[PDB]
Design a protein around this ligand. Sequence first.
Ligand SMILES: O=C(NO)c1ccnc2c1ccn2Cc1ccccc1
Ligand SMILES: [Co+2]
Ligand SMILES: [Co+2]
Ligand SMILES: [Mg+2]
Ligand code: NA
Length: 304
Amino acid sequence: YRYTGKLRPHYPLMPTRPVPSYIQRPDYADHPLGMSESEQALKGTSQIKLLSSEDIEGMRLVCRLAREVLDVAAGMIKPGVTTEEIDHAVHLACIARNCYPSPLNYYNFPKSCCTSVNEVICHGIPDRRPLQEGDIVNVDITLYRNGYHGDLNETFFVGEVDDGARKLVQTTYECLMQAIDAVKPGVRYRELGNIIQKHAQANGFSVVRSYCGHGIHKLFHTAPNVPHYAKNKAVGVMKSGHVFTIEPMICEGGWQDETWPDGWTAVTRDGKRSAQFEHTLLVTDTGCEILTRRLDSARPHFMS
Ligand SMILES: O=C(NO)c1ccnc2c1ccn2Cc1ccccc1
Ligand SMILES: [Co+2]
Ligand SMILES: [Co+2]
Ligand SMILES: [Mg+2]
Ligand code: NA
């Protein structure tokens, strides 16, 4: 395998972390290939759940808890910290909040969060590599509580970064917020990729095509499919009571991705950097609520 950049996996991985049996588990947690029977059943349906009041309270709760866990991870980002140590802290933080860390054994993913450095687009596996000054790193969190999943991510700076890193991360965050600002009943899910790609291209960046936003609630990934690029053919119209993610991945060079031999880590084919942000959103009559927002600070972590 020809690595596309400088990054390499740093093995061994710490042995798999257990979740106490007192924590409710999603179906895939105990499936040997990590398959979700509930996702596979709804595979090939395009109908989007209208959440009940009970469902909405359950999503507010788990999305609030997932934000608290991302904020734990954000506190740790500095030179010399391993991504494995971030994952260990995340894993304990979930457990402390009576949540299952959704990524764990999702299609056999080995860890409790994804940590994506520099050319990694998404789904990076926490490992023994110490963060270096100049790195950008994304931490992607998803929790499962009382049957509901809540999903968010942010990209962070590792000490001082270059002007390129600042522009890439700022623009990706702007893409996400412009998409969110368009969300309201009656808007087609395919329109968000037009707004995202228009703002990436105006700043000289490309948009990953292989990974999309998703419906989320009782399932980790379900309808709708929400592409981040222009002129996609996503099916569906936003209705009050829909919940889904927007999670644009923006790249310095081309959009093309490939996967490491580990089967998970997605990287730019050209080895240039990619950044990502993600929120979980509830469509309301007036617009949108950001279920994974910060409650106690106006700005994402990179802004400070
Ligand atoms: O937080 C997440 N997204 O916002 C999240 C998303 C999608 N897939 C995930 C994670 C967790 C683990 N896998 C599963 C996987 C399956 C085949 C290839 C690569 C990864
Ligand atoms: Co996520
Ligand atoms: Co997601
Ligand atoms: Mg090394
Ligand atoms: Na990256």
